[PDB]
From a paper:
In Gram-positive bacteria, the McsB protein arginine kinase is central to protein quality control, labeling aberrant molecules for degradation by the ClpCP protease. McsB is a prominent member of the specialized bacterial kinases and has the unique activity of phosphorylating arginine residues. On a molecular level, the McsB kinase is composed of a specialized phospho-transferase scaffold for arginine phosphorylation and a dimerization domain aligning two subunits. Aside from this regulatory role, the phosphoarginine (pArg) mark introduced by McsB has a broader function in the cell, serving as a degradation tag that directs client proteins to the ClpC:ClpP protease.
We obtained crystals diffracting to 2.5 Å resolution, revealing the atomic structure of the McsBBS octamer. The octameric particle represents a tetramer of dimers, with each dimer resembling the reported McsBGS structure in its subunit contacts, domain arrangement and active site organization. The four McsBBS dimers form a molecular cage having the length of one dimer, 110 Å, and a diameter of 80 Å. The phosphorylation chamber has well-defined entrance gates with openings of approximately 25 Å. Potential substrates have to pass the entrance gates in order to reach the active sites, which are buried within the inner chamber. Octamer formation proceeds along the extended edge of the brick-shaped McsB dimer, where two clusters of polar residues enclose a small hydrophobic core. Strikingly, the electron density revealed that Arg194 is phosphorylated at a terminal amine of its guanidinium group. The pArg194 phospho-guanidinium group is accommodated in a complementarily charged pocket of a neighboring dimer. In the McsBBS octamer, Arg337*, Arg341*, and Ser285* of the molecular neighbor closely interact with the pArg194 phosphoryl group, whereas Asp338* tightly binds to the positively charged nitrogen of the pArg guanidinium function. It assembles into a self-compartmentalized kinase stabilized by the auto-phosphorylated residue pArg194.
Residue numbers in the entry:
A (entry chain A), C (entry chain A): -1 to 211, 215 to 363
B (entry chain D): 1 to 211, 215 to 354
């Protein structure tokens, strides 16, 4: 574990991702992803070990320890220098894909603030990821373009004038651009409306998946599925428009259940807080259920004195990889449920004692 | 009206005292049934006769006192509001049948240790209620009250049969003893259903609280008493309860050692429900209070008194909750006010 | 516990009941019961404590320590001198009824060999019971008449010339005689035939009950239900005839399943022996199931080297009252299942080591 690997696996929620983005009650994050390949180098499907090593080596040489103004310094993490639990944490923080952990010459060039993650030797040689809190696809696209320009200064992209950027996936040819949004939709699930919505979203060339990428914790990721022939601007508007609708529909449904079944909803969310604050065993499944309830309670003003950032942190912190990393070494499922309960209840008791004791001074 | 204190407090100060084995045995009850010689049983008595029985107690007993028990006061069932009558049932001071008797009454000791029901199934029902496991002391108190009443009353007796009661089974001593026991471990470990039939073979009967086994609270009483002496009736129950106390404690210790973390999770989750819910029924309330009580008993839950739980067990009953709130309440309204009451009482203790 | 009470609660199977009676593969025991009342004494329903005490006292005075030639010495046990577990054992050995344990002045005059049990102050003042192993109702009736003559020498029975012996139950008036047979009918249960038989038995004025008096262990007690107007000889023939039919039908059904499903039946009974010989926990319910299977295996020659007397003993010995008595004090159900398993497996391992080691010498 290098000092920079420790830096990226240490915190479940980066300071970058703790910032308040627009519509952050419904949209947790926005992701922009640009795929490219080296000109004259065979796509990862048919390239040699030597080729893959050169891609990583060229990045360590020209981009490691280098900087972009306004984004910060970039550090290169090689998958081969990371223990299995270290790699899982990077997955659970949404910094790398699961498939990157299986790539023998996989690596990722990460900005120190964790806003930019350039995956190397995944499905394409280069996958630039920009991750913003809340709803900011245009802002994420700008950062993506800065990193893209930065890399193209020293890398010649597989490009042709009639097809655009050449990618391994034939559908991906063109912009290499994929946009996804992470959304918390507890009211649309609760009111039994989401299963009549998802089929409509899939009609618009988008795809809906759970947090992993079933929808535990009522968290849904909506991303571009069809991009062949679309411009960058069309790709981002196709997702933006659907997300903005979902923001409105999820808000209306929250206001609806709050107005019609106020006490039942308070009972639901405080009972879930009750579980999190007193349980001695809890699985990931139930944790996700309860965290969703409490987050809905916070958003509606029912659950008081608890910030949403604590909940975002626990959603990552209670994942099985991160929980084992944080506890030091692998753990049986039963042991995890005991450690998870202790971590959640202690983190929660801590947040209500700060809120008790700093509020008391005033 | 000193009726107010009999309806206002859920747990009498008398019942807050620690009695023996109070972790398993919540209370001990001794009940003596008698009838007036030459007055027909309540099954066939006249309005005039029933009214005289109540009047005699008002004249010669109400405002009178017993040394070591304190002053007694008469409550007439016909002078008590419907919810007041319900609170007395929920506090275990009077039976449901008494609230239905038009000439019913109860002469209550001020400390709430003694409740003499008048004009129920018999003309006189003497009951003594002690906290914990103390049948013998409760029997002494009952005989003291019995002697007191017999100074001015001639009991329906028959040389070949003993005290005459309405129910033919109760003829003889008129005595029924009862214990209220909290048996969560024998329920959890799926043993109570193989215990109850053995209890029933010994001439006892087992019932739920207030007369399903809600709250894991079991009432064990003498069912067969015909031909038995006072000493045999009390010991038959004492020996079975003593065995149950031991078995429930062993079952608790076993769970504490084999499933420590699961037991803490069960009781703290129930504490979580009680302190954070916004609606709760009587049923779930009892479930959770049983879990917290077991946690207190085993030392898992700290800083919370079992007396607070005993009090909540009464305060959350529907009659007491309506009395406490000042008017009748729909079941849904009760569940909202019950949750708020439980929530508030738990928060105050934790400060 | 008196030296004579210890004598009666010590053994689960008396030497008297270990003898081989006729048809002992199907019929475990025969019972004859004669009810009488004292002339001029109110039936137990309306008698006084004084009256009941005199009945017991007259019996202690004139019958305690007394004898009948050919039956033996009689000992009087007062229910009030017996602990609750002591009384239950006497029930589980079939010596007294459950209701006698609830009678305040109940007692029983027992012969030392346990063939005769005269219950006192139950439903009638006197209930003479004669219990024989196997199928011997006429033999049991003769012993019943000997005890009846014996008691009438010093007791004047409630009798009138037009109704006969006067008993509390109005149906019982006449002979006061009730005859029952304990039968093991595993094949008729196994072949799903017994539920089409019991309704026919109930038509003939008989009644069918489990071992207690559902049919755990496939053991059924068939007794006289209707006796008003019947002579003694008619009462005994009504039961004898039905029992003799059941003996034949149960034997034919055993021969049938043995012939058609030989290996399946051997697997069934040896698997049940397997449970009894190796289990560390077992309830009464499963014990009864397995003991029935093994007994059927012994009877058919499938299960070798194990005598039926060991099984009869275990059927009583594993009852909850006797198991607690044998172990000293009451026991939680869980503790019983552990002690029961140990008792059965050890008794069984003991019987196969005698059979191993005394057979080896020859
Ligand atoms: Mg570009
Ligand atoms: Mg008295
Ligand atoms: Mg005769």
């Amino acid at each position: 574990a290098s000092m920079s690997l420790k830096h990226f696996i240490q915190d479940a929620l980066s300071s970058w991702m703790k910032q308040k983005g627009p519509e952050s009650d419904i949209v947790l994050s926005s992701r922009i992803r640009l795929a490219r390949n080296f000109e004259h180098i065979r796509f990862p499907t048919r390239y040699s070990n030597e080729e893959a090593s050169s891609i990583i080596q060229q990045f360590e040489d020209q981009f490691s320890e280098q900087e972009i103004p306004g984004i910060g310094k970039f550090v290169l993490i090689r998958m081969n220098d990371a223990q299995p639990l270290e790699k899982r944490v990077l997955v659970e923080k949404h910094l790398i894909s699961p498939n990157l952990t299986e790539s023998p010459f996989g690596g990722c060039l990460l900005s120190e603030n964790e806003e930019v993650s350039v995956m190397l030797n995944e499905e394409d040689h280069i996958r630039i990821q920009c991750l913003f809190p809340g709803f900011q696809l245009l802002e994420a696209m700008k950062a993506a373009n800065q990193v893209d320009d930065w890399i193209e200064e020293k890398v010649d992209y597989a490009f042709n004038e009639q097809r655009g950027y050449l990618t391994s996936c034939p559908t991906n040819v063109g912009t290499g651009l994929r946009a996804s949004v992470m959304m918390h939709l507890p009211a649309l699930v609760l009111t039994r409306q989401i299963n009549r919505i998802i089929p409509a979203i899939n009609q618009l060339g988008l795809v809906v998946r759970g947090i992993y990428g079933e929808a535990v914790g009522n968290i849904f990721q909506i991303s571009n599925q069809i991009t062949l022939g679309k411009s960058e601007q069309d790709i981002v508007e196709d997702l933006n428009s659907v997300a903005a609708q979902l923001i409105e529909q999820e808000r209306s449904a929250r206001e609806a259940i709050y107005q019609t079944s106020k006490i039942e909803l308070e009972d639901r969310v405080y009972r879930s807080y009750g579980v999190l604050s007193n349980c001695r065993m809890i699985e990931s499944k139930e944790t996700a259920k309860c965290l969703s309830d409490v987050r809905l309670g916070i958003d509606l003003g029912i659950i008081k004195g608890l910030s949403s950032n604590i909940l975002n942190e626990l959603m990552i912190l209670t994942q099985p990889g991160f929980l084992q990393q944080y506890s030091g070494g692998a753990l049986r499922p039963n042991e995890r449920d005991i450690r998870r309960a202790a971590l959640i209840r202690e983190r929660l008791h801590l947040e209500m004692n700060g809120k008790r004791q700093e509020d008391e001074s005033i």
